[PDB]
Design a protein around this motif. Structure first.
Motif, PDB file in Angstrom:
ATOM      1  N   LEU A  39      -3.116 -13.854   2.487  1.00 32.49           N
ATOM      2  CA  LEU A  39      -4.518 -13.465   2.591  1.00 32.49           C
ATOM      3  C   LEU A  39      -5.429 -14.687   2.522  1.00 32.49           C
ATOM      4  N   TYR A  40      -5.215 -15.521   1.511  1.00 32.03           N
ATOM      5  CA  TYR A  40      -6.017 -16.726   1.332  1.00 32.03           C
ATOM      6  C   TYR A  40      -5.981 -17.596   2.586  1.00 32.03           C
ATOM      7  N   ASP A  41      -4.776 -17.908   3.046  1.00 28.86           N
ATOM      8  CA  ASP A  41      -4.603 -18.732   4.238  1.00 28.86           C
ATOM      9  C   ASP A  41      -5.557 -18.292   5.345  1.00 28.86           C
ATOM     10  N   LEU A  42      -5.882 -17.005   5.362  1.00 28.45           N
ATOM     11  CA  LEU A  42      -6.786 -16.458   6.369  1.00 28.45           C
ATOM     12  C   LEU A  42      -8.238 -16.777   6.029  1.00 28.45           C
ATOM     13  N   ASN A  43      -8.538 -16.837   4.736  1.00 26.20           N
ATOM     14  CA  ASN A  43      -9.890 -17.135   4.278  1.00 26.20           C
ATOM     15  C   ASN A  43     -10.817 -15.945   4.504  1.00 26.20           C
ATOM     16  N   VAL A  44     -10.362 -14.762   4.101  1.00 20.75           N
ATOM     17  CA  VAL A  44     -11.149 -13.546   4.258  1.00 20.75           C
ATOM     18  C   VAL A  44     -12.193 -13.419   3.154  1.00 20.75           C
ATOM     19  N   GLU A  45     -13.291 -12.737   3.460  1.00 23.18           N
ATOM     20  CA  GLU A  45     -14.364 -12.544   2.491  1.00 23.18           C
ATOM     21  C   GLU A  45     -15.007 -11.169   2.657  1.00 23.18           C
ATOM     22  N   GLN A  70      -6.480 -10.663  16.508  1.00 23.13           N
ATOM     23  CA  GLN A  70      -6.730 -11.337  15.240  1.00 23.13           C
ATOM     24  C   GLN A  70      -6.949 -10.325  14.120  1.00 23.13           C
ATOM     25  N   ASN A  71      -7.754  -9.306  14.400  1.00 23.67           N
ATOM     26  CA  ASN A  71      -8.048  -8.271  13.416  1.00 23.67           C
ATOM     27  C   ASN A  71      -6.785  -7.502  13.041  1.00 23.67           C
ATOM     28  N   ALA A  72      -5.925  -7.270  14.029  1.00 25.98           N
ATOM     29  CA  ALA A  72      -4.679  -6.549  13.804  1.00 25.98           C
ATOM     30  C   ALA A  72      -3.775  -7.304  12.836  1.00 25.98           C
ATOM     31  N   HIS A  73      -3.572  -8.590  13.103  1.00 26.32           N
ATOM     32  CA  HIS A  73      -2.728  -9.423  12.254  1.00 26.32           C
ATOM     33  C   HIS A  73      -3.277  -9.484  10.833  1.00 26.32           C
ATOM     34  N   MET A  74      -4.570  -9.769  10.715  1.00 24.75           N
ATOM     35  CA  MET A  74      -5.218  -9.855   9.411  1.00 24.75           C
ATOM     36  C   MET A  74      -5.166  -8.514   8.687  1.00 24.75           C
ATOM     37  N   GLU A  75      -5.469  -7.442   9.414  1.00 30.26           N
ATOM     38  CA  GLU A  75      -5.456  -6.102   8.839  1.00 30.26           C
ATOM     39  C   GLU A  75      -4.058  -5.729   8.359  1.00 30.26           C
ATOM     40  N   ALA A  76      -3.049  -6.125   9.127  1.00 29.69           N
ATOM     41  CA  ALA A  76      -1.663  -5.835   8.781  1.00 29.69           C
ATOM     42  C   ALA A  76      -1.261  -6.537   7.489  1.00 29.69           C
TER      43      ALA A  76
END
Length: 129
Positions: A39-45, A70-76
């Protein structure tokens, strides 16, 4: 479904406390890659959290990109990283009941036209006489 009026006072207290608690706790976890390494590696906020009035389901909105891929990968990754996150929050006894967290796309591409009848029909007569 729903209840309607507010009623007691605590009602709002639990809604605000729960909404803010989960929002602060959720965003806090995304601060340390200790648990959510991926999750961090993505840098989500987080941006906003939507909680149900029945205090059943807990929806959370997170800043998404302008790409389904991108949203799919992050969401997954974020989705599968929810269960564990829920437990991490449980630690906080203060929290009475911790409902299930569900991440939803902000710009949820929703295109549903309500066009049923296709025919220019209307009564009008500009004819003066």
């Amino acid at each position: 479904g729903s209840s309607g009026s507010s009623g007691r006072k605590e009602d709002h207290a639990r809604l605000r406390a729960l909404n803010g608690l989960l929002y602060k706790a959720l965003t806090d976890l995304l601060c340390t890659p200790e648990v959510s390494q991926e999750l961090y590696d993505l840098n989500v906020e987080l941006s906003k959290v939507s909680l149900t009035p029945d205090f059943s389901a807990c929806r959370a909105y997170w800043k998404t990109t302008l790409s389904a891929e991108q949203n799919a990968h992050m969401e997954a990754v974020l989705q599968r990283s929810a269960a564990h996150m829920r437990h991490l929050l449980m630690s906080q006894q203060t929290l009475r009941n911790v409902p299930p967290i569900v991440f939803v796309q902000d710009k949820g591409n929703a295109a549903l036209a309500e066009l049923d009848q296709l025919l220019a029909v209307a009564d009008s007569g500009p004819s003066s006489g």
